[PDB]
Design a protein around this ligand. Structure first.
Ligand SMILES: *O[C@H]1[C@@H](O)[C@H](n2cnc3c(=O)[nH]c(N)nc32)O[C@@H]1COP(=O)(O)OP(=O)(O)OP(=O)(O)O
Ligand SMILES: C[S@@+](CC[C@H](N)C(=O)[O-])C[C@H]1O[C@@H](n2cnc3c(N)ncnc32)[C@H](O)[C@@H]1O
Lengths: 255, 284, 255, 255, 255
RNA sequence: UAAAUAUAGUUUAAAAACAUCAGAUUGUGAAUCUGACAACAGAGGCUUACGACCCCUUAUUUACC
């Protein structure tokens, strides 16, 4: 069970992160929202009750994450689960011959820092906090859950920047799991497909309807609550480690 | 009503009046202010039934022939589900088009200059124009601008598409094209434009007026393109084609097909094939 | 939740299948053990109580599976979950030049018949039973869970026959998921590796202890109860479809 | 180089297998066609010249393959390359609710026998003859190339039987390479997409045009000669072993 | 054939890049070595003859690559092949509880810029150069080959940063291939295992010899010349697109 | 200005053929099924009607010594 566990959810002020916080808090766990100051996470933290707090920090900054982790220690005393959900995306082709447009390097860099570098920054810093924890009956010190995407396996046109960052998370899932295996920290990656999140809401409403209808079953956008349910299952299952789970309804994205 | 018997007697006169007519068609005949308008409208209904009945007689013949033949009368890699597969494949391309495809704008501000006969035809060509876009290798990002929700054009489009209207992969809105794209990247295509278009630029937005002027109204689109400071262009029909017969205002389906070929690196030889052959005596 | 659901657990007399039956029955669900007549599954069914029944049948044969499905229909009235756990393993090298020994085609056919052909036989027959179920609020008629192996991706020496059968399950999980998507049936596959089943425990104690230490974390053989927990999570999660989940503790087997 | 090597091309009377024979024979190698008697293998062998011979055999039967391989030894004296191109394609939905039709078990069984079981029958028998070869300067005794398909990764609707058989080839490609690594035999697998084989070309040109456009680039059906080129590259590359190569033009099959 | 083709090989002053240049130049092609000024690539270009030139540039910077590509345009007039072999590796655990050492963010960023950002920087910039090329009889404008690593699938301990960068390349291989498919540029990725590069041979024989013995077959470090052979095969084969080719001798890494 | 012409998906000839839209989980004639749309430049007239016949507008192509 997740009763009594302390969870540090990155980007927990909205989208998948907020849904994960709601379920874990409702199940007796304690959540620490870790999002940007302007994300409005303070209001969400108050709504979720006294078991949830808001940590204003930027994932790409080592100092900011350390302050957020220090805040989690003061309020709850320990960190047991880390969920990486913060991410950004850009819809730009690598090169457009007709328009003579080339993908901006800054756009590629920006996605990398938040999606990939930001995920590693939390993983390495949060793992240090989890090291202080004493092993339980199973010898586990903590659980780290990363949020990849189906784009890491098959990405659409113009998703090179987003795919590259999510591809890195998938590639580095097992090496980090092996790295932290001696200290008993489990690393897992969830590759959600089309979910009702602000990342996919930016697309035209008619695009969203078609993409939702293309899911074999269920033929709808992934509910963020479903993502939270899978997160809880990974936490409860001790034998899930170093694996990428695709939560997308068996949809393969054509170009 | 006095109009109902007005038709029945015309039936006795044999005024090419159909046999069965719905009350909905009767009020359309009511709007006809002139007898010739009533005469013209009734003939359209008459030929409408003639084609349907001839269609039906030739249709039941198909069923009768097929069943008779059946009475007298392995390894596969794919199931015969192709028609579904193509629709999905076009949908995926269409979704990509609205994120990166070149915007093509259909202007729907001409509803005030169209009768019911021409308004119906405009939708027919719009259905075909969008149909060819879907099947193209690189579909346009079709925009339906100035499309009033309660307007006749919007209502007619819904009936012809039924539930498919909300699932079409195109942007339909009430805002003018100037409000969606920079005014310096908009080219209002029109046969009356003093400027002749030589090269299809991929960084520009082309506006096609969804207007079917059976009753010729020259300069209607040019005035719209001149009220707002928008550039205008015309196809080089005279430059390449030996025009001999017909009007130079091509249909919407032909227009989009011409642009589609040009956008796919096709030259004027291939692009201008879609112009009706009856209009021109060869190419040069 | 799984309360009230009827599950047809293939190979439920012992091993992973039995562990799944224990959890589902204890959670309020109804189980139908489907194993060989000599497997002793009736004794296990009696232990689990009234909610559990034993249906002796052979997966490789159409007739017996149909009778087993009929027994489930008569006893409970419907089938909601199908779990495929029956399978056999053969440890024979493809060809040993030193001994001049060639892998026998009979061993390869037998492994395929039970692991691969048997799995498809249950899927196609059990799918018809779920086709009669009225769609629920989510439009789902049932769920099918398969049991692949880590050998399908990282196979060892002498596991060619086992890998081929489990590779087919991984290959065919998505085509079947697409096949049954219009009906509203979710097809999922689990690829457990090095679990504490009788088969693995039968091997030399010196060897099994070594393998138990090769798992990065937890450094122990997979608990069959853990496999049952993942089965429940797949059933509860509506968005898990057409995916292979590796439940092995981040272990990549070596030559 | 491939000059002087003796190649046993299974299913070499037509399709991909035939195209492989032309290139290898045209490059100085010797080919041994192994196809069914009903096929026009005898005519093709004569056309290819004195360096090509036809061995009528059924892959699913051990005796047929043994005689065919013995024929190669008599004519040429050794076997250096093996190409598994023989297979059958069956399309059938797992279960159709509206039609009430269930997938026939015989259809599934026969596909497995030829595509999967037949391929393994050749692999385990050729390795015996490759085991008699003296290792070359690189310590290699022979090369075995299998013909998987993109269906092994994302199969379409009704391809459950085809995907399962091809998935087994992809699953067991690495275990066999590990089995035969001490002997010195390299095992490789190719997964072509849509190729202009006689089976594919028999479809209406309306269907063929749609399939051609499905390939991102090149937007055409795969040339059988292109498949032969990769076969030569695998043979000429000593470091290609235990890997699956998709010769499909970056296409991902949709449902 | 590769006769007359112009290839831009990043990191071509030594290692795999130099081997590819040697083979391509010897086969009639013209190569443009794109490496750092201190790499000593000017001498290598002189050795390869008048058909090879050295363009000093840093892949991480847009300005340097553009100047290097301008040099290639002036010297040869066109670019036909782009081989991305430039890259560096770092060895550092994510977190060391025993030593209380945390993976500093500097190295993770450093590897990402060179291996991941540098690869994308060349891909987008060179794609413009290939865009100007007229399509050939096959409609192809150019070929882009990326150098991933086997660590992108199963990385070792301390390779989290290296795996993430190489994992990204695998992720964006298909999205870029779909992006450039209309243009007519083939994007392919090679995932070499352990090769006899100067960096690997610098390690002590105690570890170098052990790694060589871990390859099933051939049981030796990959020859860089063999990597060039695979590169030529990808260039010549028109149907190879959007795939990751593992050139490692069927070896899977242990933790 | 005058004389011949004008098919709003495209041709044919004086009503058809090929296309278009919606629905289809199609067992490989779907090579089909059930629907949608069928206006020979436009408008106004004449006549029991006629696509005839007669004015008017626009448009196209020629001629304007
Ligand atoms: O009526 C014509 C015509 O008398 C004359 N005109 C113009 N072009 C030509 C030509 O090529 N060949 C001949 N024989 N005559 C030509 O000028 C008139 C032009 O008519 P417009 O209506 O265009 O001129 P305006 O704007 O002044 O109105 P209107 O009062 O004459 O109708
Ligand atoms: C058949 S035209 C009818 C409207 C006509 N422009 C008018 O004012 O009377 C319909 C649309 O097709 C486009 N179009 C028709 N012919 C064209 C041509 N020759 N050159 C450029 N555009 C043309 C125009 O943009 C116009 O909006």
């Amino acid at each position: 069970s997740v009763k009594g566990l302390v969870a540090v959810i990155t980007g927990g002020a909205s989208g998948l992160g907020l849904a994960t916080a709601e379920r874990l808090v409702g199940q007796g766990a304690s959540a620490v929202l870790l999002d940007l100051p302007n994300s409005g996470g303070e209001a969400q933290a108050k709504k979720l009750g006294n078991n949830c707090v808001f940590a204003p920090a930027d994932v790409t900054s080592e100092k900011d994450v350390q302050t957020a982790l220090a805040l989690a220690k003061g309020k709850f005393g320990r960190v047991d689960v880390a969920v990486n959900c913060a991410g950004i995306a850009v819809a730009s082709k690598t090169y457009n011959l007709k328009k003579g447009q080339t993908h901006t390097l800054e756009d590629f860099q920006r996605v990398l820092d938040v999606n990939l570098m930001g995920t590693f920054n939390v993983i390495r810093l949060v793992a240090g906090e989890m090291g202080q924890n004493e092993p339980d009956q199973g010898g586990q010190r903590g659980v780290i859950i990363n949020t990849a995407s189906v784009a890491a396996f098959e990405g659409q046109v113009g998703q090179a920047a987003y795919s590259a960052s999510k591809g890195g998370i998938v590639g580095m899932t097992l090496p980090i799991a092996r790295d932290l295996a001696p200290i008993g920290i489990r690393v897992m990656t969830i590759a959600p497909g089309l979910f009702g999140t602000p990342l996919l809401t930016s697309l035209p409403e008619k695009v969203c309807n078609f993409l939702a209808s293309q899911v074999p079953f269920p033929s709808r956008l992934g509910d963020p609550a479903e993502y939270a349910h899978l997160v809880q299952a990974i936490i409860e299952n001790p034998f899930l480690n170093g694996e990428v789970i695709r939560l997308d309804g068996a949809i393969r994205m054509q170009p | 009503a006095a109009t109902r018997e007005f038709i029945e007697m015309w039936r006795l006169l044999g005024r090419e009046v159909p046999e069965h007519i719905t009350e909905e068609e009767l009020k359309t005949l009511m709007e006809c202010v002139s007898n010739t308008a009533k005469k013209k409208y009734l003939k359209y209904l008459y030929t409408k039934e003639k084609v349907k009945k001839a269609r039906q007689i030739k249709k039941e013949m198909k069923a009768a022939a097929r069943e008779e033949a059946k009475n007298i009368k392995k390894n596969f890699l794919f199931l015969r589900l192709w028609d579904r597969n193509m629709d999905i494949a076009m949908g995926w391309k269409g979704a990509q088009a609205m994120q990166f495809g070149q915007p093509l704008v259909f202007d729907m501000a001409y509803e005030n200059y169209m009768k019911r006969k021409e308004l119906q035809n405009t939708v027919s060509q719009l259905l075909e124009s969008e149909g060819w876009n879907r099947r193209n290798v690189d579909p346009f990002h079709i925009y339906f601008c100035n499309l009033k929700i309660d307007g006749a054009l919007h209502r007619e489009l819904v009936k012809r598409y039924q539930e498919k209207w909300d699932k079409l992969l195109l942007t339909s809105t009430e805002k003018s094209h100037v409000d969606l794209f920079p005014k310096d990247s908009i080219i209002y295509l029109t046969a009356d434009s003093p400027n002749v278009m030589t090269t299809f630029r991929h960084d520009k937005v082309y506006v096609i007026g969804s207007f079917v002027d059976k009753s010729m109204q020259p300069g209607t689109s040019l005035a719209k393109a001149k009220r707002l400071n928008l550039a205008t262009e015309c196809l080089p029909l005279d430059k390449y084609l030996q025009w001999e017969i017909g009007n130079k205002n091509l249909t919407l389906d032909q227009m989009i097909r011409i642009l589609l070929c040009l956008k796919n690196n096709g030259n004027w030889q291939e692009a201008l094939q879609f112009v009706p052959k009856r209009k021109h005596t060869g190419f040069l």
